Write a structure and sequence with these properties.
The PDB classes it as transcription (dna to rna). The structure is cut from a larger assembly and holds three copies of chain A, two copies of chain B and one copy of chain E. Chain A has one helix and eleven strands. Chain A is mainly beta. Chain E starts with 14 loop residues before the first helix and ends with a helix. The chains are: A mainly beta, B alpha+beta, E mainly alpha. At the B-F interface, helix 1, helix 5 and helix 6 of B face strand 2, helix 1, strand 7 and helix 5 of F.
């Protein structure tokens, strides 16, 4: 993380589409280095669903400038997650903060 | 006007790592010459032990992932570089790690022999998340001096090592940082004598009574080429 | 505010400290500015230019 | 050339119509092969690796 | 070591060396032991060191 | 613990009072350690003898200019400081000068004790203009260590001096300017090693290479209770 930022590090990491953000809120059920399984909260469910969202992170791939792209998870096993949080920091992100 | 010679007078342990050693007495000039010729050697070359090769089964290279662990295997290699061991009898050992079950994999879970002793058992290596998932690795520890990168070791070998034996960069030196202070010594008649308080900070794989003896053995060996041979 | 924040963590108000030399062991005459700067790397590496 | 024709009659070396034009790593590069993909045309028998 | 544009030198020293030469040739007032007399320049390095 | 040791000495000797030594190869970072541990000992810990207190009859201060002499009373002390003196057995020898007539006073014109030697006797001390304008001075030689100026003596010595006793700056250490560099030298496979170039100029009383041994044995004897 940068020690002296401008508070705009939070908006650029989320909106760039390089992190994995939660659509619905709930409790994290299982964390791997590749996938993240999240159990949806009760009121944020739809009446014909099973209520599990599965995020599949993308491991070591190739960018256009021949650099790395790698998404590591940042949550732990069994902790609550609200809507719009950051579940997986990408290449230059750090707890949802841009960090070059 | 003949001289006065110092002596290793006091050693105290602030913590398991932090130490503070004093030398007394010194003359005027030598209090600031030995205090700088003992920092420039204790930071550069001191023999310690470090992790060199890690071999986790089922995994080919260091740029993949294993099931049921939180980190990538490259993060496990970055965690295994900061491991403070102490090998006494031999000069190279192989340690085994076995773990199965939900929870972290601390450094205390390594089935050690009688000679090696992991001095910081609260270290964190991995994180297991599934019940069926497990991990198993063999870890080679050598003895060295200075900093030896991975490209030098892969360039200076010729036998074919099998696919899977990952290489870790090795930082061998135990001393992290070191400062020294020179205060007025407490001598009753020779008033202007000095004392030298070397303030050492390391990890738990060195002894401050031994580090100054090594760092002065080296200095009395390098000056042996100046005292007789011209 | 920077001087009101530096006095919280027991640091000099001027921001400059008295550095000692590494080689010779003497100390410099003036105080020297020491702190933290967020350094980046850049894509113009030397392995792709030689 | 005639002197090479003499050399290949002194010894029995007769290199065939085969000729090496393989793929090599460009110089000043270390690394680790982490992925290999093989595409093949229709109607062509695949290898063992493919 | 001379420019073809004009007779001025082109190996004129740049910023850091000229700052060192400016700092070396100055004078304070008290300055820790002024007014003493010396033999040569070789006993002025021994006093500074 | 292998610790590569140098065997290339190659003493280029420019003059009989000015040598130039080189050492190669050393470990990466062992150049400045030995090159600074020897500089801080030779400059301010080498013992030796020098003129420290002089007394002339006719003057009593640092500015009362004597008469019949060519130079003033301040230029005599700079000439007296550069006097290469060694002793044999004693510690405090009082020396007395006598020269009359018109002519330059040269440092060989002094009655010597049996144990006191003067290295460069062609040293000029003064210059006399008039005929029957003589000179006489009481020169005190002591034994000390390093460099002591005239400020720290008269600042702390509250005791009153015998009036007429001028305080001369002392140079007890028998080495003049020492400087050193560190250049990069190589072995057949390693390349980050380094050579060390020790340049030394001195006065008499000491072979310019022997001062390096005399400082190295002082530093090596200091580390006896650590090995």
């Amino acid at each position: 993380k940068p020690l002296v930022g401008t508070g705009m590090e939070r908006a650029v990491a989320v909106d760039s589409g390089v992190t994995a953000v939660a659509k619905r809120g709930g409790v994290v059920q299982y964390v791997d280095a590749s996938r993240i399984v999240i159990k949806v909260n009760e009121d944020e469910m739809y009446p014909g669903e099973a209520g599990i969202d599965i995020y599949n992170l993308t491991k070591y791939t190739r960018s256009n400038q021949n650099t790395c792209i790698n998404q590591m998870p940042c949550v732990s096993l069994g902790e609550p997650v609200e809507r719009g949080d950051v579940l997986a920091d990408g290449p230059s992100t750090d707890l949802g903060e841009l960090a070059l | 006007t003949e001289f006065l010679k110092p002596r290793l007078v006091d050693i105290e342990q602030v913590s398991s790592t932090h130490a503070k050693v004093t030398l007394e007495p010194l003359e005027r000039g030598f209090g600031h010459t030995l205090g700088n010729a003992l920092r420039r050697i204790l930071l550069s070359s001191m023999p310690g032990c470090a992790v060199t090769e890690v071999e986790i089964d089922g995994v080919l290279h260091e740029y993949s992932t294993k099931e049921g662990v939180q980190e990538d295997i490259l993060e496990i290699l970055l965690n295994l570089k900061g491991l403070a061991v102490r090998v006494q009898g031999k000069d190279e050992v192989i340690l085994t790690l076995n773990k199965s079950g939900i929870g972290p994999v601390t450094a205390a879970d390594i089935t050690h022999d009688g000679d090696v002793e992991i001095v910081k058992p609260q270290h964190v290596i991995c994180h297991l998340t599934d019940e069926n998932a497990s991990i198993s690795m063999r870890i080679k520890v050598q003895r060295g001096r200075g900093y030896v990168p991975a490209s030098t070791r892969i360039h200076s070998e010729e036998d074919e090592r099998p696919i899977g034996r990952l290489l870790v960069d090795a930082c061998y030196s135990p001393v992290e940082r070191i400062a020294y202070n020179v205060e007025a010594a407490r001598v009753e008649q020779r008033t202007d004598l000095d004392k030298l308080v070397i303030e050492m900070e390391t990890n738990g794989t060195i002894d401050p009574e031994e580090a100054i003896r090594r760092a002065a053995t080296i200095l009395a060996e390098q000056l042996e080429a100046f005292v007789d041979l011209r | 505010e920077i001087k009101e924040l530096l006095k919280l963590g027991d640091l000099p108000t001027s921001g400059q400290i008295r550095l000692y030399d590494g080689r010779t062991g003497e100390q410099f005459e003036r105080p020297v500015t020491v702190g933290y700067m967020y350094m980046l790397k850049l894509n113009h590496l030397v392995d792709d230019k030689m | 050339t005639p002197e090479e024709k003499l050399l290949r009659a002194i010894f029995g070396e007769k290199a065939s119509d085969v000729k090496d034009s393989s793929l090599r790593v460009p110089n000043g590069v270390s690394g680790t092969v982490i992925d290999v993909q093989v595409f093949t045309r229709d109607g062509v028998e695949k290898d063992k690796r493919a | 070591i001379l420019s073809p544009a004009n007779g001025e030198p082109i190996i004129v020293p740049s910023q850091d060396v000229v700052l060192g030469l400016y700092y070396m040739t100055r004078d304070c007032v008290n300055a820790k032991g002024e007014g003493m007399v010396l033999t040569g320049p070789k006993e002025a390095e021994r006093l500074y060191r």
